[PDB]
Target: PH-interacting protein
Amino acid sequence: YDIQAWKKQCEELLNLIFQCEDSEPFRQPVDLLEYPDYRDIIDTPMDFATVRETLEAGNYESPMELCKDVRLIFSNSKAYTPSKRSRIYSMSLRLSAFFEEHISSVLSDYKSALRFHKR
Ligand SMILES: COC(=O)c1ccc2ncccc2c1
Model:
């Protein structure tokens, strides 16, 4: 029932994601010189460095906020890909599976702790 424990759990999950080869396209903002039409398709850019900086600044109030920004990384990849068989999109699907498998217990433990607080 620790209402604060989600933050270190999210820091350690971001560390695993940065060690994964599949995160490399997603670590920094998409390069607009490399992809000159990017902002014609994508209204809200997002990347893992932005997620980690928002967490370390104390600008997430809950793990659900962090989960919404990480899911935006993956939806941007799906919207920008020219093909469902593209290399970078394929990397996004593996990394999304890994993220969802790990964030499940973080969300469950937080929501249980808050229900206990408010009992
Ligand atoms: C041929 O596919 C691509 O070049 C591609 C596909 C997905 C992407 N996702 C994010 C950033 C860049 C991306 C690029």
Summary: Residues 25, 30, 35, 77, 80-82, 86, 88-89 surround methyl quinoline-6-carboxylate (CB under 6 Å). The two ends are 12 Å apart (CA to CA). Residues 63 and 107 are 6 Å apart (CA to CA). The helical segments are 6-19, 38-41, 48-56, 63-80, 87-117.
